[PDB]
Write a protein that binds this DNA or RNA. Structure first.
Ligand code: NA
Ligand code: NA
Length: 151
DNA sequence: GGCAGGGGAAACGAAGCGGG
């Protein structure tokens, strides 16, 4: 195993998670309100108006915000239990990597109450909710990846 | 630590690397 710089470790970590999510989406899509984080020009991650210092802040912020929804995913893939867990843990690893390359920590209790609301919804909305966490996490990560390759 | 960091990767958005 050749040694990887920080940036290289980060690039591989995101490709790892993107792979895991893809595996969950197949288990979702074939078996077929929210304010999920999203990239916007203000964040300065796109080519138009790129700023590294604030982009990295948005990525870490967005990922910390994504954690409640990854926790929600754990009890929606009973057989793919291992795969949801891997996505949840790898993302926590990713945050830890990004925090050394670098703000708004989500409030635990606000998260915990949102979680039990999502968990109480009826099956149909729950299946809708799963699909869009996956889709939106994907897009935040693809965009995070595209960014970080510049930094 | 160590054997090494922090239990375990090219076609037009399929193919296929390690216990306490
Ligand atoms: Na080890
Ligand atoms: Na160890």
């Amino acid at each position: 195993r050749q040694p990887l710089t920080s940036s290289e470790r980060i690039d591989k970590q995101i490709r790892y998670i993107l792979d895991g999510i893809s595996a969950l989406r197949k288990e979702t899509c074939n078996k077929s309100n929210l304010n999920l984080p999203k990239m916007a020009e203000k964040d300065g991650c796109f080519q138009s108006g790129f700023n590294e210092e604030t982009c990295l802040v948005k990525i870490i912020t967005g990922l910390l915000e994504f954690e409640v929804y990854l926790e929600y995913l754990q009890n929606r893939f009973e057989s793919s239990e291992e795969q949801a867990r891997a996505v949840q843990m790898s993302t926590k690893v990713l945050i830890q990597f990004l925090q050394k390359k670098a703000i708004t920590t989500p409030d635990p209790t606000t998260n915990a109450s949102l979680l039990t609301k999502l968990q109480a919804q009826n099956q149909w909305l729950q299946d809708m909710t799963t699909h869009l966490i996956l889709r939106s996490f994907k897009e935040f990560l693809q965009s995070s990846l595209r960014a970080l390759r510049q930094m």
